[PDB]
From a paper:
We isolated a panel of neutralizing anti-receptor-binding domain (RBD) antibodies elicited upon natural infection and vaccination and showed that they recognize an immunogenic patch on the internal surface of the core RBD, which faces inwards and is hidden in the “down” state. Class 4 anti-RBD antibodies mainly recognize a patch of the molecular surface conserved between SARS-CoV-2 and SARS-CoV.
Our cryo-EM structures of the spike-Fab complexes revealed a three-RBD-up conformation for the complex with all these class 4 antibodies, because only in the open state could their epitopes be accessed. The cryo-EM of IY-2A-Spike complex also shows a similar conformation of the 364-375 region with the unwound α2 helix to accommodate the binding of IY-2A. The residues 364–375 region of RBD in this complex exhibits an unwound α2 helix and a newly formed left-handed 310-helix at residues 369–372, creating a novel interface on RBD. The majority of class 4 antibodies lost or had greatly reduced neutralization against the Omicron variant. Only IY-2A retained neutralization against Omicron BA.1, BA.2, and BA.4/5, with IC50 values of 0.23, 0.27 and 0.17 μg/ml, in agreement with its binding activity with Omicron RBDs. A more balanced example is shown as antibody IY-2A, which creates a conformational epitope, tolerates all antigenic variations and compensates for the energy cost of its induced fit with extensive hydrophobic interactions. Moreover, the unexpected binding mode of IY-2A has revealed that an epitope of RBD could be created by a conformational change, and in this way the conventional epitope prediction based on the pre-defined structure would be rendered incomplete. All bound RBDs are in the “up” conformation.
Residue numbers in the entry:
A (entry chain H): 2 to 28, 28A, 29 to 212
B (entry chain B): 44 to 70, 81 to 93
C (entry chain G): 1 to 82, 82A, 82B, 82C, 83 to 104, 104A, 105 to 219
D (entry chain A): 27 to 68, 82 to 142, 166 to 176, 187 to 210, 215 to 248, 256 to 329, 334 to 473, 490 to 518, ...
The structure:
């Protein structure tokens, strides 16, 4: 029942030290190795971590990891940050002989000033209501780095029925954009009156609500 | 070693010596084991 | 230093087997667990297997039924086989070394480049843009979100402008959205002030050089 | 960007004076053609091995420096301010601001050092802080100063970085003050050749290894070198990598043996002197748990382990957790004691698939009750009885704690070498020792099965047999040789043609290959001219002009 959790968004200016962890869920994380990864755009992670603290030849001496038994959590740390290391970091652990991966961490090196998220909420078109169809799209644009998580709420209760998150990527002017495709039914639109689109950029959450 | 003449000191059987030839089926005390014994 | 490279057929189709070849440069196979690492783009990895000099191998149970690795000391190469490729098989593949105990492959201590192996078996289709009409109400912020989405088309990229590009202030071109059907889901949303809204004409233009397919649709606030 | 420094960083080597003396010396120099960062635009300098600080400005823009790693309470630092009245040094780990501007126990005041050149040197050598000062009025020119010593403090604090200080007439952005220029040169231990004129001052300096011309000048200890062939040094090929190599290793019966012994009759076997066969199937190697200290895979290249010690005992499943360092209870005391600095690897695995019997297995026993703990490495052959002893119950219907478990502990006592091999390249070869350097190619040598290695004349070995795949390699000590510097004389020019002795550069300006070796820097002409500088192996030189 091993589960691997890593922080969604970690940001760091160039030259400073940044660390990314993979928290153990079931059992004592000390017995099982947790290996920290890196995924460039269009690339795949490789294996560079064993005994959690050594750096080999052919790989820079700055990529360092650690596993601490006190908080039952892992850690991968970067000391000499460079803009080339823009890579999505994932953690993989052993589950009683089963190779089980994690959700991963998206790491981005700051190249632009931070941008607060912009969220707008509108109801779907009234022409399609005759076909008993209602899909919801929540806008997330003008935010840098591009890492948000969309949390839906149903009368002060989270819901993740048909969430279709999108990957932020640079626009014409280098900034990111994201959306979340929500699917519900027109019948519950009459039973529900308060829905919010909580988006988590860095540590800030901004939401909007509409009512019938 | 390959194709090279050498000279080495060690415990050797010196050349042209008389070794004791005994047939054990006829006629046992202690046979002395010196520094080096060449038995056959 | 040892350099590891990968090369092979990058366009796959369902129901046949994945084949990929790796060659070693300036290295030996003594005391190394050579392995392959897989990850679908955007998502997480799915580790393939391992092999050492004598050929002792271990596979992921999800791939053991479908994966096969071979080592060739005569040709100083080792290859990968992966049968019954699916939509989940679309991923980049690398070859890499290893240092561990009897098959602990965690220091493939050289970054792999690899190829792009994708499953592509479909046909070209026609786009059908649909209106993402706004609520046309006085929101808290005096800005109206207008957009249009493109469906049933292949492949990326698709370039979308507004008023032939004349509208540029609020335009927000998005990347493609990865669905499960196998097509690219594009949408462009423009932010316009509420004061200038109601009668002004806004058109988003769909453009694709390869298939010579252009769509120009006007989206209205409300009816 | 960056810029090269032509002739900056010259000073009296020994801080002593000589008259009319040419002399070559090594010390903490600024090497010729070293990097300095021009700071001309419409700043923290790390103190690596000494900083040569130069400033060009009409007026006194620079106020001083703030040295120190962090300049906090817990980090030792230093402040120097050079005023028009006096210079103040405070080595007391004082706290300094990030953006310099002006309006503990230590303290120090001394005389002030002074379109204007000002040079200074901070040196952190042998637990001593050396300060040199110089002031003169004014592509980089060849500006020269025999930088006489000024100060040498005996105090050592962590000095790594410093930054210039600027103070304006008035401020809170601000006034358009001038952009001062300063160059920083990191000091390096280097050797030069100097000439001191009859009045006794440094006037001419030559890097010992700037050019082959510079090297022949440093060889002759002079500055005028006639036309001829001169021998300076030797090209030695770097030996690339070090390759280490090690009739079956009996690793199979250590863990996969069908039958094991009990705890009292623990089995210990040393395994070495054999090809390491680790591929034999044991459990398909489903290694999900591993962490070892003391031994690491990296060191096997430069570490050869002496012995392999294996220790075996028999326990049950729900008690393997209690067998670890820092564990208490009756289980570890009466079964097996783990040392604090255990050097080895822990292997634990399931053995129900092999140790399952229809009628039950009574061949696994363990001591649960005793008067006292067994001594380490104790040998007992007594059969005195304290049923007194209980045997494990191995049923498929019992809990997970009743599963049979084979547990063995491996230890490495340092009172076997590492793999890897390359061929056809000048490398450092080691085979359980036999540390040699050279090229290992295909060998014209064929040996006899016990003939482990062969020798040539002058006790230089010829071949090596492979401990792994049993193949024979030819060894030649690395391809290297001296260098001769054809120089037609500083009177004429400064064009050097350097010959490597007995080296083929086909296998490591225009480069020619002659019987004597590899002549680079010479445009090999084929024409007939009288010989002036014989280069070697029948070839001579001339000046093209």
């Amino acid at each position: 029942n091993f589960m691997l959790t890593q922080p969604h968004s970690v940001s760091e200016s160039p030259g400073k030290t940044v660390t990314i962890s993979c928290t153990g869920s079931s059992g004592s994380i000390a017995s099982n190795y947790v290996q920290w990864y890196q995924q460039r755009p269009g690339s795949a992670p490789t294996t560079v971590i064993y005994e959690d603290n050594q750096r080999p030849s052919g790989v820079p001496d700055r990529f360092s990891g650690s596993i601490d038994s006190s908080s039952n959590s892992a850690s991968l740390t970067i000391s000499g940050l460079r803009t080339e290391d823009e890579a999505d970091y994932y953690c993989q652990s052993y589950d009683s002989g089963i190779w089980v991966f994690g959700g991963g961490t998206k790491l981005t090196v700051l190249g632009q000033p931070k941008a607060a998220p912009s969220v707008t909420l509108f109801p779907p078109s009234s022409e399609e209501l005759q076909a008993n169809k209602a899909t919801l799209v929540c806008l997330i644009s003008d935010f840098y780095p591009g890492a948000v998580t969309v949390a839906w709420k149903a009368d002060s209760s989270p819901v993740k029925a048909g969430v279709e998150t999108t990957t932020p990527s640079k626009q014409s002017n280098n900034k990111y954009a994201a959306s979340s495709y929500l699917s519900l039914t027109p019948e519950q639109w009459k039973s529900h009156r308060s829905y919010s689109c909580q988006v988590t950029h860095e540590g800030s959450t901004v939401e909007k609500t509409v009512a019938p | 070693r390959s194709s090279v003449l050498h000279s080495t000191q060690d415990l050797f059987l010196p050349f042209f010596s008389n070794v004791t030839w005994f047939h054990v089926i006829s006629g046992n005390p202690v046979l002395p084991f010196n520094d080096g014994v060449y038995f056959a | 230093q040892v350099q590891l490279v990968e090369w092979g057929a990058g366009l796959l189709k369902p129901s046949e087997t994945l084949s990929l070849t790796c060659a070693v440069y300036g290295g030996s196979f003594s005391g190394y667990y050579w392995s392959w690492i897989r990850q679908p783009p955007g998502k997480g990895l799915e580790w393939i297997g391992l092999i050492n000099h004598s050929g002792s191998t271990n596979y992921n149970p999800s791939l053991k039924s479908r994966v096969t690795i071979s080592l060739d000391t005569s040709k100083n190469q080792f290859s990968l086989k992966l049968t019954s490729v699916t939509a989940a098989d679309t991923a980049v593949y690398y070859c890499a070394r290893g240092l561990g105990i009897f098959g602990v492959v965690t220091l493939s201590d050289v970054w792999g480049q690899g190829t792009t192996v994708t499953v592509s078996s479909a046909s070209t289709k026609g786009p059908s843009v649909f209106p993402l009409a706004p609520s046309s109400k006085s929101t808290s912020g005096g800005t109206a979100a207008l957009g249009c989405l493109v469906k049933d088309y292949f492949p990326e990229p698709v370039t979308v402008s507004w008023n032939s590009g004349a509208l540029t202030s609020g335009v927000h071109t998005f990347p493609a959205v990865l669905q499960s059907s196998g097509l690219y889901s594009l949408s462009s949303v423009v932010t316009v002030p509420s004061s200038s809204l109601g009668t002004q004409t806004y058109i988003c233009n769909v453009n694709h050089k390869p298939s010579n397919t252009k769509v120009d649709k006007k989206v209205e606030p409300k009816s | 960007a960056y810029t090269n420094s032509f002739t900056r960083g010259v000073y009296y080597p020994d801080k002593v004076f000589r008259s009319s003396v040419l002399h070559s010396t090594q010390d903490l120099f600024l090497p010729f053609f070293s990097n300095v960062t021009w700071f001309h635009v419409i700043p923290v300098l790390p103190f690596n091995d000494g900083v040569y600080f130069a400033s060009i400005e009409k007026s006194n823009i620079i106020r001083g420096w703030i040295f120190g790693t962090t300049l906090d309470s817990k980090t030792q630092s230093l402040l120097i301010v050079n005023n028009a009245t006096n210079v103040v040094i405070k080595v007391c780990e004082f706290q300094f601001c990030n953006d310099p501007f002006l309006d503990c126990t230590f303290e120090y005041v001394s005389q002030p050092f002074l379109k204007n050149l000002r040079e200074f040197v901070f040196k952190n050598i042998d637990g001593y802080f050396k300060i040199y000062s110089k002031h003169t009025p004014i592509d980089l020119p060849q500006g020269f100063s025999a930088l006489e010593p000024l100060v040498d403090l005996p105090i050592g604090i962590n000095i790594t970085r410093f930054q210039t200080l600027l103070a304006l007439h008035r401020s809170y952005s601000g006034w358009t003050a001038g952009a001062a220029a300063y160059y920083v040169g990191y000091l390096q231990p280097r050797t030069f050749l100097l000439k001191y004129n009859e009045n006794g001052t440094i006037t001419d300096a030559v890097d010992c290894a700037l050019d082959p011309l510079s090297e022949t000048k440093c060889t002759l200890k002079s500055f005028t070198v006639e036309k001829g062939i001169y021998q300076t040094s030797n090209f030695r090929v770097q030996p690339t990598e070090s390759i280490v190599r090690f009739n079956l290793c009996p690793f199979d019966e250590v863990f996969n043996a069908t039958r094991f012994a009990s705890v009292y009759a623990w089995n210990r076997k040393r395994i070495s002197n054999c090809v390491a066969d680790y591929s034999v199937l044991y459990n398909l190697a489903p290694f999900f748990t591993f962490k070892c200290y003391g031994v690491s895979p990296t060191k096997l290249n430069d570490l050869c382990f002496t012995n392999v010690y294996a220790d075996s005992f028999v326990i049950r499943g729900d008690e393997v957790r209690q067998i670890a360092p820092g564990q208490t209870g009756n289980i570890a005391d009466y079964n097996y004691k783990l040392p604090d600095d255990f050097t080895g690897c822990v292997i634990a695995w399931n053995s129900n698939k092999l140790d399952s019997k229809v009628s039950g297995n009574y061949n696994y026993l363990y001591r649960l009750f005793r008067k006292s703990n067994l001594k380490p490495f104790e040998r007992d052959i007594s059969t005195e009885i304290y049923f007194p002893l209980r045997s494990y119950s191995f049923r498929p219907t019992y809990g997970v704690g009743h599963q049979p478990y084979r547990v063995v502990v491996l230890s490495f006592e340092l009172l076997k070498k590492s793999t890897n091999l390359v061929k056809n390249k000048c490398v450092n070869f080691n085979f359980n020792g036999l540390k040699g350097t050279g090229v290992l190619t295909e060998s014209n040598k064929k040996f006899l099965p016990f003939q482990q290695f062969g020798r040539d004349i002058a006790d230089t070995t010829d071949a090596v047999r492979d401990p792994q795949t049993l193949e024979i390699l030819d060894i030649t000590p690395c391809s290297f040789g001296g260098v001769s510097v054809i120089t037609p004389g500083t009177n004429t020019s400064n064009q050097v043609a350097v010959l490597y002795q007995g080296v083929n550069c086909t296998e490591v300006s225009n480069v020619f290959q002659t019987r004597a070796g590899c002549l680079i820097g010479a445009e090999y002409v084929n024409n007939s001219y009288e010989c002036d500088i014989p280069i070697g192996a029948g070839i001579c030189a001339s000046y093209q002009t």
